[PDB]
Amino acid sequence: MDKNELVQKAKLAEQAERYDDMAACMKSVTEQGAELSNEERNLLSVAYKNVVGARRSAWRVVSSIEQKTEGAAAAQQMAREYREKIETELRDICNDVLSLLEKFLIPNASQAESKVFYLKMKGDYYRYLAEVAAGDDKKGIVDQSQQAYQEAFEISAAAMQPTHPIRLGLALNFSVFYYEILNSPEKACSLAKTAFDEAIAELDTLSEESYKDSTLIMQLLRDNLTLWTGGGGQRRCSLA
Amino acid sequence: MDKNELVQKAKLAEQAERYDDMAACMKSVTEQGAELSNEERNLLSVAYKNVVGARRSAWRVVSSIEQKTEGAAAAQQMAREYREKIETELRDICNDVLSLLEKFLIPNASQAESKVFYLKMKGDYYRYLAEVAAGDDKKGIVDQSQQAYQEAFEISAAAMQPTHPIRLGLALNFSVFYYEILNSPEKACSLAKTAFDEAIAELDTLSEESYKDSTLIMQLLRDNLTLWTGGGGQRRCSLAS
């Protein structure tokens, strides 16, 4: 009922790996209308990442079974209808988060850091709707994702150092969006490479608080770059 | 809706890792009242293992937090009430399985193999109720677990070879019951060691079909035995240590 009780209940849930409970608690906290702390916004984000993630995983498994069925009309319709059921759940979860973002989180965000966090998150949840959208719907959904990420990118680039984990994490997810939603390998690689290179150039700007997150996201950016540029498998390096 | 459809739905759910769906489908199959195939009984078992397992995990985490807060009345009540909520879910899942076992699976089992499987499973689900039972009902719950395992043990010892994976898996779980529920490490070790040694003495009774299952369960029995009798040695063994 009280904000701190709901937060303590959310952290309990998180320990128990009961992400529905964790999400329901943090949704209630968000709905009380006060600006979330860093800790609370992280709890919300982790909870819904897990809730939506379970459906995304399931969706890819069942979608793949649907396709790798030629010849069984009955088997294929069953896979199809289960995919559609999972898709409905996925859409409902995304719409819950996107509505929290629109009504509470984005309007109340008093700092550039938190505005970027939430705009990134809006980009993410429209990207998840984009992963399962067809047809005319899809282009509208894709455009919402891109505009959210783009606004995040611009605020971030003006307010935040290149090693800031939120700026780096935005670059990672926006690059993935270019690669797999807009089907642009070269734009995805330019975005990820630029973010990696700018951060490498200023590792003294790291603090103790965020260096682990920043360097971890940097590694993920470079991994994607390797995957997308067909790199790797060269002869091992000794010092050249 | 048809049995084969429900089974195909269960396998889909399994692939999606949607164990509630998988369990719902296999519960419906069980309720049609015909004897389950080996495949169907495995699907049922895997589904409910996952459904109950999520609560078991959660229950141990939250129960531990409840104890490791001897100070904080507010924190205590919240952990306690959350433990209780998880416990209620756990009990309802156990009661669902135990009812299917009592009403359909045990009575219809026409082979010793399947009778042992289900009596073991009844042993297991009463054991999971025993893990969370406090006070006056606990002794009754513990005794139901033990009688189920014991009847399984006797049928198994009469009808199945010592290398049969179901006989081995029963010995594994019944030894755990002795160790953890009856706090009887000596009996738990004796049961596990006997089952291991009896299988070693009749390795010709392995079939090509399930030797991989048998030898893996043998390894698990000996791992428990090592854990319970105070860990691995220092000092690597060469031949004739």
Would the CA dihedral through A106, A55, A1, B62 be positive or negative? Answer: negative
**Partner residue opposite A65 with nearest CB, options B15, B54, B86:** B15
CATH number for the domain harbouring residue A208 = 1.20.190.20
CA atoms of B224 and B172, how far apart (whole Å): 8
**Nearest chain B Cα to A55, which residue?**
B16
- A-facing residues of B in 90-119 (CB < 8 A) are none
For residue A238, tell me if it sits in a domain.
no
- Shared-domain flag, residues B54 and B137: no
Return all residues near A229 (Cβ < 8 A) that are at least 6 apart: A189
Give the experimental resolution in Å: 2.0
Q: Which two tokens stand for residue A108?
A: 């109340």
With an 8 Å Cβ cutoff, are B78 and A12 in contact? yes
Q: How many domains, in total, are found in chain A?
A: 2
Would the CA dihedral through A170, A171, A174, A179 be positive or negative? Answer: negative
- Shared-domain flag, residues B58 and B128: no
For residue B92, the Cα-to-chain-centroid distance in whole angstroms is 17
**Partner residue opposite A75 with nearest CB, options B8, B17, B61:** B8
- Shared-domain flag, residues B144 and B100: no
For residue B41, tell me if it sits in a domain.
yes
For residue A34, tell me if it sits in a domain.
yes
Nearest-CA neighbor of B100 among B165, B47, B29, B193? B29
Nearest-CA neighbor of B228 among B180, B176, B170, B185? B185
Where on the phi/psi map is residue B71: left (φ > 0), alpha (ψ -120 to 50), or beta? beta
Q: Which two tokens stand for residue A185?
A: 């390998």
For residue A13, tell me if it sits in a domain.
yes
The residue type at B176: V
The angle at the Cα of A197, spanning A194 to A200, to the nearest 5 degrees, equals 150
* Interchain contact A9–B (C-beta under 8 A): yes
Q: How many CB atoms lie under 10 A from the CB of residue A204?
A: 6
Would the CA dihedral through B83, B86, B92, B94 be positive or negative? Answer: negative
- Shared-domain flag, residues B154 and B193: yes
CA distances from A34 to A105, A110, B38, B119, B140 (A): 9, 11, 56, 55, 51
**Partner residue opposite A78 with nearest CB, options B8, B16, B18:** B8
* Interchain contact A189–B (C-beta under 8 A): no
For residue B159, tell me if it sits in a domain.
yes
Domain span at residue B53? 1-69+76-108
For residue B233, tell me if it sits in a domain.
no
Q: How many CB atoms lie under 10 A from the CB of residue A194?
A: 14
B62 Cα to chain A: minimum distance (Å): 6
* Residue at a domain's end among A63, A89, A108: A108
Q: Say if residues A121 and A88 touch (Cβ distance below 8 Å).
A: no
First CA to last CA distance, chain A: 63
- Shared-domain flag, residues A139 and A38: no
Would the CA dihedral through A167, A173, A176, A182 be positive or negative? Answer: negative
Return all residues near A197 (Cβ < 8 A) that are at least 6 apart: none
- Shared-domain flag, residues B99 and B2: yes
- Shared-domain flag, residues B98 and B15: yes
B67 Cα to chain A: minimum distance (Å): 14
- Shared-domain flag, residues A90 and A150: no
Nearest-CA neighbor of B189 among B139, B151, B224? B224
Which residues of chain B does A81 touch, with a Cβ-Cβ cutoff of 8 Å?
none
Q: Say if residues A2 and A32 touch (Cβ distance below 8 Å).
A: no
Q: Write the DSSP symbol of residue B35.
A: P
Which residues of chain B does A75 touch, with a Cβ-Cβ cutoff of 8 Å?
8
For residue B235, tell me if it sits in a domain.
no
Return all residues near A22 (Cβ < 8 A) that are at least 6 apart: A10, A13, A14, A43, A46, A47, A50
Q: Which two tokens stand for residue B35?
A: 């004897």
CA atoms of A186 and A189, how far apart (whole Å): 5
For tokens 């755990």, the residue is B176
Nearest-CA neighbor of B58 among A27, A89, A54, A21? A21
- Shared-domain flag, residues B191 and B159: yes
- Shared-domain flag, residues B145 and B123: yes
Q: Say if residues B173 and B127 touch (Cβ distance below 8 Å).
A: yes
Elucidation technique: X-ray
Q: Say if residues B112 and B157 touch (Cβ distance below 8 Å).
A: no
For residue A129, tell me if it sits in a domain.
yes
- Shared-domain flag, residues A84 and A68: yes
